[PDB]
Design a protein around this ligand. Structure first.
Ligand SMILES: CC(=O)N[C@H]1[C@H]([C@H](O)[C@H](O)CO)O[C@@](O[C@@H]2[C@@H](O)[C@H](O)O[C@H](CO)[C@@H]2O)(C(=O)O)C[C@@H]1O
Ligand SMILES: CC(=O)N[C@H]1[C@H]([C@H](O)[C@H](O)CO)O[C@@](O[C@@H]2[C@@H](O)[C@H](O)O[C@H](CO)[C@@H]2O)(C(=O)O)C[C@@H]1O
Ligand SMILES: CC(=O)N[C@H]1[C@H]([C@H](O)[C@H](O)CO)O[C@@](O)(C(=O)O)C[C@@H]1O
Ligand SMILES: *[C@@H]1O[C@H](CO)[C@@H](O)[C@H](O)[C@H]1NC(C)=O
Ligand SMILES: *[C@@H]1O[C@H](CO)[C@@H](O)[C@H](O)[C@H]1NC(C)=O
Ligand SMILES: *[C@@H]1O[C@H](CO)[C@@H](O)[C@H](O)[C@H]1NC(C)=O
Ligand SMILES: *[C@@H]1O[C@H](CO)[C@@H](O)[C@H](O)[C@H]1NC(C)=O
Ligand SMILES: *[C@@H]1O[C@H](CO)[C@@H](O)[C@H](O)[C@H]1NC(C)=O
Ligand SMILES: *[C@@H]1O[C@H](CO)[C@@H](O)[C@H](O)[C@H]1NC(C)=O
Ligand SMILES: *[C@@H]1O[C@H](CO)[C@@H](O)[C@H](O)[C@H]1NC(C)=O
Ligand SMILES: *[C@@H]1O[C@H](CO)[C@@H](O)[C@H](O)[C@H]1NC(C)=O
Ligand SMILES: *[C@@H]1O[C@H](CO)[C@@H](O)[C@H](O)[C@H]1NC(C)=O
Lengths: 490, 490, 490
């Protein structure tokens, strides 16, 4: 009559890494790193994004003629742009504080276009100017949301305009200044030389003067256009004055909603799906705390690490080999209803079992460990992407250094944490088996023989009931004391 | 005659958290998170703060007539300001590089004022100008630290002024330029159009031109004032030249004492009390390494984390349930002078005791662990909080992201460290008790009998000397070898 | 006969610190912090650096007459500059976007100088002007890379220049503007007043106007020169137009190598050695993951920490003490070929041995632990120094905060990891010894007597063959069952 204590084995292949051993085969393991995506650009929280196509933000806001499908645009979750868009400023020039404008646009999610200065109010100036830089069907055209003011007859009277913000929210306004190529152009389009453009609000004051010089030809023109923007607050007034070289606004963009968004630089197209975290390669649907798909993500996404394998050991070491011996010689492939268990070989029968209390305690501990590792990582909505000009390289280097510093910190911490936790779990399982063996030995005392292969041989004739008794935890030592003593001495 | 080994239990109700278990009762515990504050704005290192009240830094530095209390400010420890101060620039305008000026004023103390260009030296100009915005008792007035130069008679001669810095330290100088509303104002105040303001030092060269345009009315005026500042070095000269629109300074600001300070935005008042670390809600007086009062602190303060509980286990589990028995089935309540100890029962009266060597070793170990966790944190003076304009949103986002990332790193590290150390301590105590049990068993050998509940019953008569020897560690096996063997056989 | 189980001891005095104890002497230990440098500056990847002597970057790029040793400069690995160079702008002035230029030079390893606007092309102007500030041998001179244009006779025609970039790479061009001290100087140098300087490329468009004012005397002059730079792209034209006050370029700097470099502030010369990582005090040659030599490093360097001692415990505890006893009364000094082993004493002699399996397993575990700690740190090329101007103090403070935060995080993590790992390995060794003792006891069963000091006394006659059978894990218990039985009961 023998009783043996052991653990459980299977046909698993997955391997984990500990701080002392590498490539250790375990029974059950949990992957806490996500490596897959759907490869498609989908909606964020059920709202389709804004697809600029071949247009740029400046071209969309200014009203580039090759972007007329973007005039009235619905609700958006984020903006999709190309790395090198083709349809931007049709007329060669520049845009002041472009990056700040893009950063502001990353938190809007809806604009409403309001006609603040109609084109018919300029009754003392010509408002039908155009250029071949952005022409439609051959005939010259211009930006749709802007007005080019030239001379009427041989006179250019002082141009004045005003607007009071009675719309309901903040309103973005854009204006421009034209830099000619020679004095002949200046006198042909604005009569007099030595002009200025003055813009004034409650908290703004700007005066600009055109620059006339020969420049290299871009899109066939030696002239330029410089654009500036401002934010007008509620119940505030904006004033425009000009003697020449003014590209007036006709529309203003009031902010309808506000929230969290970003700019994704992709060359793909929207397709029908819905997710919660978006990457340029695809979308992520997971509950794990780590991923290694792409550094630039928008939404509520797991932490990004430079790792290829992060596996937490959830089960026992898989020694496949085992008269049936116990935990000294290896694991057991017979018993399948528990982690730690018994095997009895009495006359009534020979069979496996599984201790319930120890297995439940170990299961609770391991599950609590996994939940502590996973559910302690704070996740927040973020748009990890910023844009800097060619004269702000130091700030870009600063941002990059911060990002890589955090990446290395998190990578090192995650790898080391996984290694030590795996070691501790593997030690914990052996400790539990040894504790069960010691408990049985202490409770059951001298009436037996310790075969030393990991299990016990009784001296009396223990029937089934005594086997359940020793498994139960309540074993009557005095009952068999006399009978066991007789055979033990002989 | 029997001897039992066990541990200590009391009526404590403290609770800690481990990596495998939650809500575990312990005998003693230490809180390493501070969650309390005085509730008062104190004096840092004895020096009282600078209380601006309803004033701004610009108002204090320029001499707003309402803020006539702060004309003789003494030494300060930190600056207290309001989120939206009321008395700032009475005459509408702007202040260039305002945030850099505030950042400089952070690491300055005491501060002295020296008259450099007395108002009585401008003998060829008028100096009694004023406005109704900065009015005292109804009559018009102006800033106290600045002079408004206006034409005298019907002429405005070229205005020149030089100052050599022989004070003894670096100096702060502020000047301004006036932007009128119409040309009639310009001719009434300065008699000529097309003026300039030129400022020159050894490392500075600035030329500014007035802007005349119609603007929205702020405080009843359409005109504006633009203010600029510079830092004059020792033995360096500053030159002012102007044809019009010059607001000259009369007082320069010498830096008197340097150090470390900051700006705190609070709607509070100073009260008689002292501290060493300050928070906008109150003062912190603690030595613990972590706190969760407020993220914006001035001084040398513990690390800020987003947690509500950080408790370290410095004791044993509280399993208070014991024919005395030992450590197998629970702790004792009679032991009041040790952690691990003995209970002895013989013919000369039973009683408790306490093993001193093991208890002392464990106490020293736990003390070293707590001191290692606490004393390896670096605490340096810092003042969390900076200011950014409305055109620097990207820099503000960068600062916010950096602070949030560090906060997340520290929170995660602290929680995981506490959990792992709690698990290790709770295993350490069990290992110590089992070590004591094994040592006693090895000493006593076959002369005794084990009972399985944690203690031994002898096979001879073991009086107080015998049992003290067992506790002492010097137990004589040969002395009772014959006596104990005789009883064991039968 | 007698067998004993023990561990190794030696004469080492290396001490390590754990989380529970301090100053624990160990047999072997490994230092993972580097503290040694050669105290010399030398080549990075074989290329000698660019030693600027007493010159500065601006003085080198503009051609200071006292910097004529750098007119033709070969390839470099990094740049060495003094903190306060004596030789800079000989003519007093400024240099716009200097820090951006230095950052650009922090990623270029070779320049090629190309003559783009020959000095003899200006046939309508005088090009021989020079000043006493940049004097050579007592005669007035000027920069060697720039041309000072001045009126010929009594006429200053419009000056026009152009250059088309057909060189083959990106190019750097620097121009200047002159600010005189009085109208007399302007009239004597350029005849006319009301002057502009215009520079134009396909992206850049700049117009500047001279300022005439009385300024403090620097280097004996009250005039200034302001320099600006631009990056011309391939197949792009740059145009210069001027009516006066133009300091034209004569040379352009084409990028020829491109790579990763940096600027180091030092005060020494260049020696003959080679290194992969460089610090201002010396070079580092190590494979360890941490160092405390200097924070400002250039190259591929280990992490910087503020610790003074980081030692990992590789060997076991040194407890020098003692037939002879076992592992409870100290470690054996006579064992030299292993970590854990046996001592045997029988009628054919006495001696020591070593258990190869346990020692090999422990050695592999410790090696893997050290390798895991060491080879999981990412070492990329980096340059830490960054330069900021006097108006960018907030940016500098943000940079300093990031560096301090990362330093603190890494120091805390390294120290805590070392302490915890030392405690775990010190427990690991004791666990291994106890496991060997338990294995021998289980194999030997009741045939022996456990003396209690780690030694077993046999109840029979055991020759050398039986002793070796015990050590190799193959003991035939039944064969000695009968013989050892008689001696036990007698
Ligand atoms: C020298 C001086 O301070 N002169 C005026 C001053 C200026 O005219 C300028 O407006 C600076 O603020 O302005 C003050 O007076 C004004 C009114 O009294 C007048 O009715 O309307 C003016 C505007 O058209 C102007 O507001 C003022 O600021 O109240 C004071 C002083 O007379
Ligand atoms: C074409 C030229 O370099 N001419 C002067 C030059 C200019 O007058 C200007 O000052 C640029 O530095 O300046 C030099 O000469 C000067 C003295 O010789 C003279 O006594 O005082 C001048 C100032 O009032 C001026 O300093 C010079 O820099 O020394 C050289 C050259 O003659
Ligand atoms: C009012 C106006 O737009 N005038 C003419 C402009 C200007 O003269 C400048 O060239 C500015 O581009 O130029 C065009 O010839 C051209 O761009 O082809 C179009 C048009 O005839
Ligand atoms: C572990 O196994 C992988 C294959 O899955 C192999 O590439 C790697 O070299 C192994 N490492 C060790 C240390 O055996
Ligand atoms: C703008 O309109 C608001 C009401 O919508 C009014 O109170 C305000 O006075 C107006 N602005 C001006 C300059 O009149
Ligand atoms: C096992 O213990 C339970 C107590 O929960 C008892 O009800 C049951 O009868 C016991 N079984 C045996 C075989 O002793
Ligand atoms: C300013 O005063 C110092 C004396 O402390 C003198 O050396 C210096 O020349 C003076 N400045 C000027 C411009 O003369
Ligand atoms: C801080 O608390 C201690 C009590 O531990 C007290 O002695 C000390 O006076 C307190 N200091 C302040 C500034 O409140
Ligand atoms: C107990 O140990 C102490 C050692 O400090 C010794 O002085 C004393 O005599 C010992 N007593 C007995 C009864 O062994
Ligand atoms: C450990 O040794 C160092 C000398 O190396 C000594 O300064 C320190 O005080 C010692 N610490 C303890 C706890 O003995
Ligand atoms: C650096 O150390 C290595 C040892 O691995 C040695 O071979 C090499 O010569 C050393 N180089 C220098 C420049 O000291
Ligand atoms: C162990 O060594 C002994 C030598 O005494 C040898 O007889 C035996 O076969 C060895 N066993 C194994 C498994 O290597």
């Amino acid at each position: 009559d023998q009783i043996c204590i052991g653990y459980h084995a299977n046909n698993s292949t997955e391997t984990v890494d500990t701080i002392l051993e590498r490539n250790v085969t375990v029974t059950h393991a949990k992957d806490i790193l996500e490596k897959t995506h759907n490869g498609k650009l989908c909606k964020l929280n059920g709202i389709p994004p804004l697809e600029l196509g071949d247009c740029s933000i400046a071209g969309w806001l200014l009203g580039n003629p090759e972007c007329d499908r973007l005039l009235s645009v619905p609700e958006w979750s984020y903006i999709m742009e190309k790395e090198n868009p083709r349809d931007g400023l049709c007329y060669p020039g520049s845009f002041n504080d472009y990056e700040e404008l893009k950063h502001l646009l990353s938190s809007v999610k809806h604009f409403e276009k309001v006609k603040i200065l109609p084109k018919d109010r300029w009754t003392q100036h010509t408002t039908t100017g155009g250029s071949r830089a952005c022409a439609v069907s051959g005939n010259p055209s211009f930006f749709r949301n802007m007005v080019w003011l030239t001379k009427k007859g041989s006179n250019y009277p002082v141009a004045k305009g005003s607007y009071n913000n009675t719309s309901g929210e903040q309103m973005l306004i854009i204006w421009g200044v034209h830099h000619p190529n020679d004095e002949t152009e200046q006198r042909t389009l604005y009569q007099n030389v030595g002009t200025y453009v003055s813009v004034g609000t409650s908290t703004l004051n700007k005066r600009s003067t055109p620059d006339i010089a020969t420049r290299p030809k871009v899109n066939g023109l030696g002239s330029r256009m410089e654009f500036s923007w401002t934010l007008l607050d509620m119940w505030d007034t904006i004033n425009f004055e000009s003697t020449g070289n003014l590209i007036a606004p006709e529309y203003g963009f009031k902010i309808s909603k506000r929230g969290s968004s970003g700019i994704m630089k992709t060359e793909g197209t929207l397709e029908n799906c819905e997710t919660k975290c978006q990457t340029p390669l695809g979308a992520i649907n997971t509950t794990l705390p780590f991923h290694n798909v792409h550094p630039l993500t928008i939404g509520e996404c797991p932490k990004y690490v430079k790792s290829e394998k992060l596996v937490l050991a959830t089960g026992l070491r898989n020694v496949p080999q085992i008269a049936i011996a116990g935990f000294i010689e290896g694991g057991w492939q017979g018993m399948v209803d528990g982690w730690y268990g018994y095997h009895h070989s009495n006359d009534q029968g020979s069979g496996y079992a599984a201790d319930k209390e120890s297995t439940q305690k170990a299961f609770d501990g391991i599950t609590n460990k996994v939940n502590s590792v996973i559910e302690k990582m704070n996740t927040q909505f973020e748009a990890v992407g910023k844009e800097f000009s060619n004269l702000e390289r130091r700030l870009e280097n600063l941002n990059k250094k911060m990002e890589d510093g955090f990446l290395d910190v998190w990578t090192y911490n995650a790898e080391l944490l996984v290694l030590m936790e795996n070691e501790r779990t593997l030690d914990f399982h052996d400790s539990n088996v040894k504790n069960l063996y010691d408990k049985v030995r202490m409770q059951l005392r001298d009436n037996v023989k310790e075969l030393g292969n990991g299990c016990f041989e009784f001296y009396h004739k223990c029937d089934d009931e005594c086997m359940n008794s020793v498994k139960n935890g309540t074993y009557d030592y005095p009952k068999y004391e006399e009978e066991s003593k007789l055979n033990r001495n002989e």
